[PDB]
Amino acid sequence: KVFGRCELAAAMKRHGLDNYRGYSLGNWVCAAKFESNFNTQATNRNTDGSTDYGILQINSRWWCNDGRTPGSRNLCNIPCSALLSSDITASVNCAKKIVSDGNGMNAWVAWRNRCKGTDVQAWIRGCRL
Template identity: 55%
Template sequence: MKVLILLGLVFLPMLAHGKVYERCELARVLKQNGMDGFGGNSLADWVCLAKWESDYNTKATNYNPGDQSTDYGIFQINSHYWCNDGKTPDAKNVCGISCRDLLTDNISKAITCAKRIVQDFQGIRAWVAWRNHCEGRDVSSYIRENLMSGICLFLNKTVFHPRQQ
């Protein structure tokens, strides 16, 4: 019994924090899911957005007392418009998903919903963090790593891992 409690105390923080992506890992997943150029936005724009919205954390949440909504997941998708958390008053659920689905390590549903959001009239400007930290700035550093690091490079929009040659 004591062993189970100890294991629970060791592993519970890992579950609560979710997956925190590395920049290149996130860029690779986003590229594989068609985000490079989607809605006229570069891969670097999406990685910059995720940095400033959630610090690349899939379990990030942020409560908004004004409209009693919550932002969920790596893209901080809002429960008032885009997902259903069962507690936000007058929620629209435009993406047709549970907000819990935005808190998993598999971000495919978050990507699908983000694609739906940018098809709206505001596009990527719907995200305040993108407007405040990414818009009008050189965001290329979000998808570039040092060749010597051995992690990854983006050359001509191609994911490249030096050790996989």
């Protein structure tokens, strides 16, 4: 599923991400835009052989099991395919663990390079929330 901007904002708000660990809603929408272009089915392979999955491009090296990343962890206790669903629940629940692990949203390279320090509230402007 390819979300609209305000559609995804409302879904993320109704999963508890607004100001989660101090990150306002616009931060999450901005991250999803540049990680996946709002597409739940996005996948990308990394040089080390791990793969990033879903709307927030969660990495199989640490967070989910895809059966082909030897020596990796599954800290969110889920198959990586669950992160590609049109229902964003699994992605949101796993993102909450990632952002709580000490490094905040710097875990998402696109957030650090394209959202951090910008007017992220622009990403939810005009949306009814």
